[PDB]
Amino acid sequence: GLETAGGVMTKLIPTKKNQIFTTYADNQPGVLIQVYEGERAMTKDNNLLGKFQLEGIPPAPRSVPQIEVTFDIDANGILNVTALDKGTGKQNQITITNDRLSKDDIDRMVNDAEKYKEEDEQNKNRIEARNNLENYCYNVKNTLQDENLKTKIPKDDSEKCMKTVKSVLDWLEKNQTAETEEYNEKEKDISSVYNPIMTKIYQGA
């Protein structure tokens, strides 16, 4: 597989496969493809085989660009990874030759995955919480300032919520890595202010 946002291992005999990915940040000019292989779910734990970066990505919002990464493996085992921009049609590729791990080193790696990947699943869940809140902050801010039509929301409630979101964004920058509960606590604290506004919008009948 390859590395996704938050150093996460996203897994992709003869077989060919593809997956669609987007940009982590707004007006991202390029995407770096990092190839990690191994039984353990974490990218960091797995050995990096090669890294290549696509460039010339058109400026666009965080989730808008569509990138297709196709991994082709034949009976020989030679890995051909190609990243293609759906919009532009611009692509980049690398080839990793099958010509050195030993049978017991592979079996040891597989055994390590069973024993340690249990703890990996917990780590993965913790990382996902970071991404979810990040996205939640962006979406709430966008909703409050998004629709010019959605100005109907009371000024007092909007001001109060905007400040809460702003405080969590600053907290997120300062605390690069935090506990799952801390992220959920922050999500819930924003959710506590925002949900009543939403109910009130649809409350009117």
């Binding site: 590395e3 996704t4 946002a5 990915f21 987007t22 940009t23 982590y24 940040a25 991202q28 000019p29 390029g30 995407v31 770096l32 493809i33 970066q53 965080r62 989730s63 990138i67 991404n131």
Partner: peptide, 4 residues
């Protein structure tokens, strides 16, 4: 999501 993919990083730069």
């Amino acid at each position: 999501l993919l990083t730069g």
